[PDB]
Design an enzyme around this catalytic site. Structure first.
Site, short mmCIF file in Angstrom:
data_model
loop_
_atom_site.label_atom_id
_atom_site.label_comp_id
_atom_site.label_asym_id
_atom_site.label_seq_id
_atom_site.Cartn_x
_atom_site.Cartn_y
_atom_site.Cartn_z
N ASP A 93 0.77 -1.24 0.00
CA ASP A 93 0.00 0.00 0.00
C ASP A 93 0.81 1.30 0.00
OD1 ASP A 93 -2.65 1.43 0.35
OD2 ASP A 93 -1.71 1.98 2.26
N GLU B 84 1.59 -0.68 -5.00
CA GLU B 84 0.63 0.31 -5.43
C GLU B 84 1.33 1.66 -5.48
OE1 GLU B 84 -2.91 3.26 -4.32
OE2 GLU B 84 -1.66 2.33 -2.77
#
Ligand code: NA
Ligand code: NA
Ligand code: NA
Length: 480
Positions: free
Chosen positions: A231, A261
């Site tokens: 993340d 990400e």
């Protein structure tokens, strides 16, 4: 076994907070495998700021819905035991499990601490816009209800370097703790994009470095993970993510797939990041997500010859995790760039039937998003998954040669009988196109797995066939 891999993000932003999700995932395992799903990306599985938190307002990485903290025992998704049961079910059904990992910040601190900090320019964090003064920041974590199980590490303000909320004068500002540096290297939008939200972790500290490496290993071992979804990595110092990844692969015996990400509609930035990582992971194809969004928003005038242009999959297919939408791009969310129903089938065909990229199916598209009256697209997706699972094999041939009508073929491979397909679509008026599907398929008569076109295409002697598509539609022809 040569089978194509297909990932599925098993959640959407507005999922019901009924604590029954891990149970649903457990019961869905068999069906998912049969449909063609080979890996599941579970949402952050640890205790967030509140029970209803989607998982990114991460409070305690060691609490997987096992301790009474933040007003609940279970997480939004269920208890730790239910999660482990779900994972067991996925394992027996030959599905890999990738855990979402949130290490950029922490939220839901148990208490505030007085901290000297300076306000910085939101569009240039390198620039202070105020002198230093004392604020009260939510930086104290004691994890009371966990009673030091698994780890007695406690967080304090000196483990962080910034926050966006001063509890003393109750104001929102981008704060940099005095005498601390923003992490580096990080994305450069806004000058230094270290800070995003919550209490921003400062990785310059060895104890923080080791704590997250150890937590990572603990987490991996606890859930027997097969990989991770990292993340907000564009906000985490590049050198650390690389160290962290290398540390986990070193500590775990099983292979670990990693998808980061890095949210930026800029393929150059993603390639630079991959360079920094020595290409030891894949990244979500954010540029492609925006390409699909641009097309969906513009309408038929969009020149389909550019649909893949500037995408990561176009440049580094083996390091790109392609997707159409996720929990952040769905309606009303932070990275909104939603692909409408009319274009969605074309976008999914694009990531599912082509040879490059590791495609990801969005739970929100598959089962729908009731919160926004978005219908389940399972019918359409299952057909494309069928194509991917059994037909998308062999040498590929592209035909992005028309502003409306584009397509590509897969010759199929001998190892997989009857494999081979011809994908043709149009974002405007319908049409047709001759495409080479491999001389070895000569004489075969192919039909549309989607049912969008009734044409029966017979492959000629040279291995060519004329495939047809109606307007604003996609067809995937195979030998069925
Ligand atoms: Na950060
Ligand atoms: Na999207
Ligand atoms: Na067009």
């Amino acid at each position: 076994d040569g089978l194509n891999g297909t990932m599925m993000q098993y959640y959407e932003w507005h999922l019901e907070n009924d604590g029954q999700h891990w149970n649903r995932l457990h019961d869905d395992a068999a069906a998912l495998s049969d449909a063609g799903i080979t890996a599941i990306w579970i949402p952050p599985a640890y205790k967030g700021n509140s029970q209803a938190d989607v998982g990114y307002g991460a409070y305690d990485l060691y609490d997987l819905g096992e301790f009474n903290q933040k007003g609940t025992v279970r997480t939004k998704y269920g208890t730790k035991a239910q999660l482990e049961r779900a994972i067991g079910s996925l394992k027996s059904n030959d599905i890999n499990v990738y855990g979402d990992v949130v290490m950029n910040h922490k939220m839901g601190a148990d208490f505030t601490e007085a901290v000297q900090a300076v306000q910085v320019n939101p569009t240039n964090r390198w620039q202070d816009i105020s002198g230093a003064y004392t604020i009260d920041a939510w930086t104290g974590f004691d994890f009371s209800g966990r009673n030091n199980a698994y780890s007695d590490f406690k967080w304090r303000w000196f483990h962080f370097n910034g926050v966006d909320w001063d509890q003393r004068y109750q104001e929102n500002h981008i704060f940099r703790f005095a005498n601390t540096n923003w992490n580096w290297r990080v994305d450069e939008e806004n000058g230094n994009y270290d800070y995003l939200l919550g209490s921003n972790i400062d990785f310059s500290h060895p104890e923080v470095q080791d704590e997250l490496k150890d937590w990572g290993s603990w987490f991996t071992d606890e859930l027997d993970l097969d990989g991770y979804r990292l993340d907000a990595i564009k906000h985490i110092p590049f050198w650390y993510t690389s160290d962290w990844v290398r540390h986990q692969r070193n500590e775990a015996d099983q292979d670990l797939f990693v998808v980061g990400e890095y949210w930026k509609d800029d393929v150059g930035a993603l390639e630079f990041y991959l360079d920094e990582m020595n290409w030891e992971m894949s990244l979500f194809d954010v540029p492609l997500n925006y390409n699909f969004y641009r097309a969906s928003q513009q309408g038929g005038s969009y020149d389909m010859r550019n649909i893949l242009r500037g995408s990561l999959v176009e440049a580094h297919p083996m390091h790109a995790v392609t997707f159409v939408d996720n929990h952040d791009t769905q309606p009303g969310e932070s990275l909104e760039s939603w692909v409408a129903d009319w274009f969605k089938p074309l976008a999914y065909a694009t990531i599912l039937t082509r040879e490059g990229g590791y495609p990801n199916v969005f739970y929100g598209d598959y089962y729908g998003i009731p919160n926004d009256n978005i219908s389940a697209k399972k019918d359409m997706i299952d057909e494309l998954l069928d194509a991917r699972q059994n037909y998308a094999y062999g040498t590929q041939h592209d035909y992005f040669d028309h502003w409306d009508v584009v397509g590509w073929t897969r010759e199929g491979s001998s190892s997989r009988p009857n494999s081979g397909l011809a994908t043709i679509m149009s974002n405007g008026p319908g049409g047709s196109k001759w495409m080479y599907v491999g001389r070895q398929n000569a004489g075969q008569t192919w039909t549309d797995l989607t049912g969008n076109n009734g044409a029966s295409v017979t492959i000629n002697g040279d291995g060519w066939g004329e495939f047809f598509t109606n307007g604003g539609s996609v067809s995937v022809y195979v030998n069925q």
